[PDB]
Design a binder for these strands. Structure first.
Ligand SMILES: [K+]
Ligand SMILES: [Mg+2]
Ligand SMILES: [Mg+2]
Ligand SMILES: [Mg+2]
Ligand SMILES: [Mg+2]
Lengths: 91, 86, 208, 134, 137
RNA sequence: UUGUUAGGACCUAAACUCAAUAACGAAAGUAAUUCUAGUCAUUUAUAAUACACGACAGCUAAGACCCAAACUGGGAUUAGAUACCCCACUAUGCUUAGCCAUAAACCUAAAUAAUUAAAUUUAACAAAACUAUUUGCCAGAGAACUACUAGCCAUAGCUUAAAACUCAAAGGAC
């Protein structure tokens, strides 16, 4: 992987993709509550998807980037992406 | 003693606001340094101590003004993160 | 506690739940909708929707109870109210039509108005400054002011009564005598206020 | 250079420090903000070691007013210490700390309730010796 | 068309009159606010004594003689004597920088006198007499 | 006695703001205003046994005396302070003539002409480092800003300054 020498190739590979999506939405240019009663995945769940240890500062930065994506106009591909990191809140 | 009375250090009361006149007179007597002069003139300050103090006050002001200048030089750079996520 | 802090105190007011939705303030309306997704504490064994349940009288019973003998304490309070109702019926029947109007025969209203007459506005907290014990005037909260009235009543009857008199006969005679602002408990209240006036000048020595 | 550069006795010190700090706060000498706060001083308590100096200022009703007064007073406490050494009130002054005094509110409260009250009618290990042997 | 903080200039013509009196005529309230005692004297513009008061004369003693509330009482007392003598407007020349510097001016207002101006005459020597030595405490 | 005085007298003493300035002088030191006199060219560094100066404090004689003030007296304080605090007052601080020659008199930096590279924190802290020149000074510590000698309007002083003795440390920056 081209980000091997960062030490968090999977965390930064994910932050690379979400930052590239944000740039295309901002360059290219409705209600954002497509999903309700959902929460952002907790750090323990994220660490499982990445399969690498994350710090608390790393989790906070990832969420802020995902929130910025929702604020911007989102095509159906973006909604599916953010869905992966949204976990149904216990009812 | 030889000058005319009621010209010096005299404020005039506006619409019976006697407190506002007094509060302005104090700001005058302080901006002109009379307040500090009267306080310090209560006891004798020896010439060696006077120079040490006035030297310290000068150096302290210069340090605060430069530190204020630096805090204001970077006042504009404190804005929302443009490169969030990278 | 076995209740997690997320649990809510139960609301056992029958009319409140059956009020029309529009009659409820939006603040009250909000709490009802919020409470639907929360945990509620189970109602106490002494908490009921009964129309005859008075919180003040229920509290006075618990302050007389000894060693968890609630049946005896409730019996003493029940006998007291009866002893006061029977004492006012005698006076009412033995009074002229003019006097009969003033006489009050409701024991619940004689109990509440009696206690209120024994509540002290100000208090005295004992402090030590300069090697002596200097108390100082204090302003009393609604909870401390109510507690003091009940405690002073339950203490005058328990101690300063003849050996053969019973609590339903001493308490009834004190609620009624306090209800007229002439009992010894009222004197205790006067002394507490009178002492504060003497020490009014030295209120400075308070740190709390 | 500059960057590197930058019983009875306690009764006398406690009373005099109070007598002087009250004067500093009655004028804009410390600052115009400190003057506008119109702060009052209950008492000054200096510690036995003289490590710090407690200044009790009569707190008010509004928490917001008190929170603002606290921040402004604390920021100027360091400068206020300078003014007392410079005017030659005391040769050595401890770090001035500002403490709240809410008794003033209680003092007014007592009078209100009291008036309304019903009084009623009247070596070998360290050395190489072991190692060299084998 | 605005109010002027600066006082009227003696020897000129101005439109400001108080109770049909010019500025030079309004009686003067001399407040000497020291660190121990606050004295007050009211005089006519011809330098004739009309009222006198002080924390001591009111009855305060020793340390209490030098507080804010003590000067306030002295000001109210000076007002009452002056009000009887026929004084409604006063020019407040406040000498001294003691605790009852402001309180004495507040007492005069509470006592029914109307202050039209506040002057300061605290002695400031221009070089003078050597002050006393610093107190070692 | 106090407060006020757009009343009189006095001209004692000290010079606010300016001064957030950094000037002058060999140093000490010098900043209220005006006027008079006045600082200046030796190539440069290098001087005593000579000459002339030298803050504060102190002495001598005659004045001055507003205020301050060792000391002294009275008042408080404490388990008691000759203390710290309050009041009164003196030597003294001022002036004009003589003397005393001492300060951490230190920018703790001798005075000069260089250079900023020597792939140089060349201990550390101060104040970047280093070279050349001339003089003075230093050679473990206590004994010792001492003893003695000599010079001196000084006489407990000032400058100059040892030995016996005793030790294995003393001392500096972190
Ligand atoms: K004495
Ligand atoms: Mg003179
Ligand atoms: Mg000339
Ligand atoms: Mg004398
Ligand atoms: Mg010899």
């Amino acid at each position: 992987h081209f980000l091997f020498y960062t030490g968090k190739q999977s965390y930064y590979s994910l932050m690379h993709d979400v930052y590239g999506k944000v740039m295309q939405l901002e360059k290219h240019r409705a209600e954002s509550r497509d999903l309700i009663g959902s929460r952002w995945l907790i750090k323990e769940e994220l660490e499982e998807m990445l399969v690498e240890k994350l710090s608390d500062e790393d989790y906070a930065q990832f969420i802020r980037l995902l929130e910025k994506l929702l604020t911007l106009p989102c095509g159906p591909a973006e909604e599916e992406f953010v869905q992966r990191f949204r976990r149904s809140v216990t009812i | 003693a030889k000058h005319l009375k009621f010209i010096a250090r005299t404020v005039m009361v506006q619409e019976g606001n006697v407190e506002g006149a007094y509060r302005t007179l104090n700001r005058i007597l302080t901006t002109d340094g009379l307040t500090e002069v009267i306080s310090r003139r209560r006891y004798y300050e020896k010439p060696c101590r006077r120079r040490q103090r006035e030297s310290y006050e000068t150096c302290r002001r210069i340090y605060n003004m430069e530190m204020a200048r630096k805090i204001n030089f970077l006042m504009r750079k404190n804005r929302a993160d443009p490169w969030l996520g990278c | 506690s076995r209740y997690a802090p997320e649990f809510r105190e139960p609301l056992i007011d029958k009319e409140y739940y059956r009020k029309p939705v529009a009659e409820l303030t939006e603040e009250e309306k909000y709490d009802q909708e919020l409470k639907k997704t929360q945990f509620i504490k189970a109602a106490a064994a002494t908490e009921t929707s009964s129309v005859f349940a008075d919180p003040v009288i229920s509290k006075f019973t618990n302050m007389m109870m000894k060693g968890g003998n609630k049946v005896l304490a409730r019996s003493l309070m029940a006998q007291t109210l009866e002893a006061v109702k029977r004492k006012q019926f005698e006076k009412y029947r033995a009074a002229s039509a003019e006097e009969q109007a003033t006489i009050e025969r409701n024991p619940y209203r004689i109990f509440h108005e009696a206690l209120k007459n024994c509540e002290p506005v100000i208090g005295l907290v004992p402090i030590l400054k300069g090697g002596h014990f200097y108390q100082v005037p204090v302003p009393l909260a609604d909870r401390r002011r109510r507690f003091l009235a009940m405690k002073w009543m339950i203490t005058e009857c328990r101690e300063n009564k003849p050996r053969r008199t019973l609590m339903p006969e001493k308490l009834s005679h004190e609620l009624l005598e306090a209800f007229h602002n002439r009992g010894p408990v009222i004197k205790r209240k006067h002394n507490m206020h009178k002492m504060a006036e003497a020490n009014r000048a030295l209120a400075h020595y308070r740190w709390w | 250079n500059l960057l590197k550069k930058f019983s009875i006795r306690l009764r006398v010190l406690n009373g005099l420090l109070y007598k002087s700090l009250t004067e500093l706060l009655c004028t804009p000498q410390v600052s115009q903000e400190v003057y506008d706060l119109n702060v009052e001083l209950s008492k000054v308590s200096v510690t036995s070691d003289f490590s710090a100096c407690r200044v009790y200022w009569k707190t008010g009703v509004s928490a917001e007013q008190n929170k603002h007064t606290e921040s402004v007073l604390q920021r100027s406490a360091a400068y206020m210490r300078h003014l007392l050494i410079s005017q030659q009130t005391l040769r050595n002054v401890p770090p001035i700390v500002f403490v709240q005094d809410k008794r003033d509110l209680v003092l007014a409260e007592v009078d209100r309730l009291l008036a309304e009250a019903d009084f009623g009618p009247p070596h070998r290990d360290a050395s190489p010796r072991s190692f060299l042997l084998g | 068309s605005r109010f002027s903080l600066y006082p009227p200039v003696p020897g000129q013509e101005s439109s400001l009159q108080w109770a049909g009196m010019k500025f030079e005529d309004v009686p003067i309230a001399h407040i000497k606010a020291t660190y121990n005692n606050t004295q007050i004297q009211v005089v006519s513009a011809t330098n004739a004594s009309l009222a006198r008061a002080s924390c001591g004369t009111e009855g305060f003693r020793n340390a209490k003689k030098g507080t804010g509330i003590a000067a306030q009482t002295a000001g109210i007392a000076a007002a009452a004597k002056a009000t009887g003598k026929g004084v409604t407007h006063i020019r407040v020349v406040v000498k001294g920088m003691g605790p009852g510097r402001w309180s004495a001016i507040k007492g005069l207002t509470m006592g029914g006198l109307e202050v039209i101006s506040i002057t300061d005459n605290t002695p400031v020597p221009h070089x003078g007499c050597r002050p006393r030595k610093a107190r070692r405490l």
